[PDB]
Design a protein around this ligand. Structure first.
Ligand SMILES: [Ca+2]
Length: 399
């Protein structure tokens, strides 16, 4: 079977549960498309009711910030006539506005501006769909694929720079507030039976180091790479290359979303994380199997310094096996970050800078996450992870 007709193996992670992930492998010849621009992609996907098995091949670079004539769109094209960053900054300055959500004219103008961009860059993927990169250079630039459906396969594509021109100021976010942006490369919002494999995710030609600071906080134009929220379940993410980005993957969006308990069953294996700051992943509630992943970075990088790998959030149940972390000078405890409600973590075979460590025990956590993985392929010895992952992870390694 060619790349477009391949399906997820019957034991390959949580994605293989029940009906498994076959994407659009059963598509008839008339539902097999090759797309090379935004117009073709949107037409091939159709609406949310287009559940007919379909295979979409991406050829070349697809820029999502383009109009209907495929001409580039910049900040001014999306900007509401009444929006002005200078006026917005003056209006919501914490010294005069205080710590409360922005409201009024400038925030309304900012929100309208953001909705203009959202209409072009966010695309919903319908059920029973396989989207694969043709050849070695398939790319999606600026777009945010949203998956709310069942049975979707995304492979061999490089996703770059899901950039938000109008970040929202949120003074109540954290201790000193933060600027929040809306687009990920891939957003799994209630989606089920998904396989993301051999993809590459990065911030393209607009790294966060080029962003200014307003109110003492970075003016962040990016959000996540592969995030999962609102009951997403039965997902396998394998052989992906995540690099040069801040917040990579958040599974479970809120401590109050107790409906996520029993869901967010995600398997992450053979992924490469290079120069990723945090959230790799940051989990709430889910039974997440993390194995054979390779993490590399530096705490003194000038662009994307390592902060932590695994985020232990409320009721998270990370089961980690044979993962390798290469961050010179890092202490064993700082491989992870423990958040509100995070009490347990099971990790075995963890290597930090070639040394066997126990991340859970270094943070005084419980090792009882209460479950044991049932769906997984062969687990590589920790000593072989770095080579296997560097050589095989990312887009352009298959075709
Ligand atoms: Ca997100």
């Amino acid at each position: 079977a060619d790349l477009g007709h391949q399906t997820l193996g019957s034991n390959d992670g949580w994605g293989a549960y029940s009906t498994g992930t076959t994407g659009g492998s059963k598509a008839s010849s008339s539902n097999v498309y090759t797309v090379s621009n935004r117009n073709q992609l949107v037409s091939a996907l159709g609406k949310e009711t287009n559940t007919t098995p379909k295979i979409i091949y991406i050829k070349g670079t697809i820029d999502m910030n383009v109009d209907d004539n495929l001409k580039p769109l910049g900040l001014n094209d999306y900007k509401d006539p009444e929006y002005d960053l200078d006026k917005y900054l003056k209006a919501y300055d914490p010294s005069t506005w205080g710590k409360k959500e922005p409201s009024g004219t400038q925030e309304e103008a900012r929100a309208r501006s953001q909705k203009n961009q959202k209409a072009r860059v966010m695309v919903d993927i319908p059920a029973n769909t396989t989207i694969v990169g043709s050849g070695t250079n398939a790319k999606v630039v600026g777009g945010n694929f949203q998956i709310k459906s069942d049975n979707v396969i995304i492979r061999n594509i490089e996703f770059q720079d899901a950039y938000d021109y109008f970040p929202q100021w949120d003074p109540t976010d954290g201790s000193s507030g933060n600027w929040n942006s809306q687009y990920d490369n891939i957003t799994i919002n209630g989606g089920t039976h998904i396989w993301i494999d051999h993809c590459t995710f990065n911030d393209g030609s607009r790294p966060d180091s080029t962003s200014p600071k307003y109110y003492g906080r970075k003016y962040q134009h990016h959000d996540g790479q592969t995030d999962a929220s609102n009951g997403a379940n039965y997902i396998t993410m394998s052989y992906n290359y995540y690099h040069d980005h801040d917040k990579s993957s958040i599974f479970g969006s809120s401590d109050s979303k107790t409906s996520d308990d029993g869901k967010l069953k995600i398997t992450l294996h053979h992924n490469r994380y290079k120069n990723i700051v945090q959230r790799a992943p940051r989990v709430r509630f889910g039974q997440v199997h993390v194995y054979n992943n390779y993490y590399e970075g530096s705490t003194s990088s000038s662009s994307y310094p390592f902060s932590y790998a695994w985020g232990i959030g409320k009721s998270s149940k990370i089961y980690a096996q044979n993962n390798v972390i290469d961050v010179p000078g890092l202490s064993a405890a700082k491989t992870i970050s423990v958040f509100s409600g995070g009490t347990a973590l099971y990790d075995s075979g963890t290597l930090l800078n070639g040394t066997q460590i126990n991340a859970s025990a270094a943070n005084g956590l419980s090792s009882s996450v209460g479950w044991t993985p049932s769906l997984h392929g062969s687990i590589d010895a920790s000593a072989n992870v770095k080579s296997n992952v560097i050589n095989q992870a990312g887009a352009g390694k298959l075709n």
